[PDB]
Amino acid sequence: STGSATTTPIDSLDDAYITPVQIGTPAQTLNLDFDTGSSDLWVFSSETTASEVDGQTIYTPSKSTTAKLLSGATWSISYGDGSSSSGDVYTDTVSVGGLTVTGQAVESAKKVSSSFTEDSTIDGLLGLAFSTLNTVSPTQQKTFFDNAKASLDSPVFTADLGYHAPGTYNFGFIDTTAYTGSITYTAVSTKQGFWEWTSTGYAVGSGTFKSTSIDGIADTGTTLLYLPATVVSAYWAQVSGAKSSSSVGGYVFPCSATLPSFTFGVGSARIVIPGDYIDFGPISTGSSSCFGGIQSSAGIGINIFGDVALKAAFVVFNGATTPTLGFASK
């Protein structure tokens, strides 16, 4: 089997991407944030505290003939950005782009933090990291990908995120028309439960490539590119007037600037992030200070190849017995 679904930015900045997901019988379609940095599939639901729902579409398990309460199971998750959610668990039929999993754990939110409430466009998350990170207790549950894997034509999914445009998540096949050149594969460590890999270095604009190992995670659920302070300083030093602002919470730059590209290494291959991808617009409405898309990972504890980086590539998440990651230009 295979699946193919379009993923769409939630706003003009590509702050996140939503992908329609069919849950239950008859289908209830919710728009979920596919997150290769976490491993829970959770949804706004009929159980979510009323005051914490503001415009989201909810899953109502009582209206699904295939829903079953997973007795005694609870979940609770905290994300890198400080947001969180928790609740109980159903199993139900879940389909993405024509690919169907029966008996998928669907984690129903009883509580969500303010940032989830305040984002009316995201109806929940669909985790695509390794199932070892799944938070369901007392019996850990499998991700949608883990459940689908055996049935897939090939044990892979791909992320093809658009810049200010829709893109695609495919399951079970590699669309050879979706990228240019060849796909360069690189080793993955699953020791922390992430799609963790080591970039071979970077360049800023038309500058020379610096060969240096940068360990980090491929994380579709993180907006920006978070890298070591040395790398980030080298980038922003090429933008007149750019500076790190503790009050704003990172590097800002004059909105009048033309940003240089940023290149990262994948083995001997190179992925180029155009400068425009690094512009996250005014810090507040009407400001001439703009927020940067490359930020320091210092104090996160991990480097994160988030959407800014991933949307510059066609990315293969290869879930074979020994997982690997592939990157192609597009």
Give just the sign of the alpha carbon dihedral 99, 173, 271, 256. negative
Annotated active-site residue in 35, 88, 92, 119: 35
DSSP letter at 132 equals: G
Known catalytic residue: 206? no
The residues, any chain, with a CB within 8 Å of residue 119's CB and separated by 6 or more, are 10, 16
Cα–Cα distances in Å, from 174 out to 26, 137, 147, 265?
30, 34, 19, 21
Annotated active-site residue in 85, 95, 199, 296: 199
In terms of DSSP bridges, do strands 210-218 and 303-305 run parallel, antiparallel, or are they unpaired?
Answer: parallel
- The residue type found at 302 is I
Give the tokens for residue 312. Answer: 């510059």
Q: Quick one: CA torsion of 231, 235, 236, 238, rounded to 10 degrees?
A: 140
Known catalytic residue: 33? no
Nearest to 43 by CA among 54, 52, 55, 56: 56
Give the tokens for residue 101. Answer: 């999993």
Show the CA angle centred on residue 305, arms to residues 115 and 129, nearest 5°: 70
> What is the C-alpha to C-alpha distance for residues 211 and 222, in angstroms, rounded to an integer?
25
DSSP string spanning 163-230?
SSS-EEEEES---TTSSSS-PEEEE-B-TTSS-EEEEEEEEETTSPPEEEEEEEEE-TT--SEEE-HH
Catalytic residues, by residue number, are 35, 199
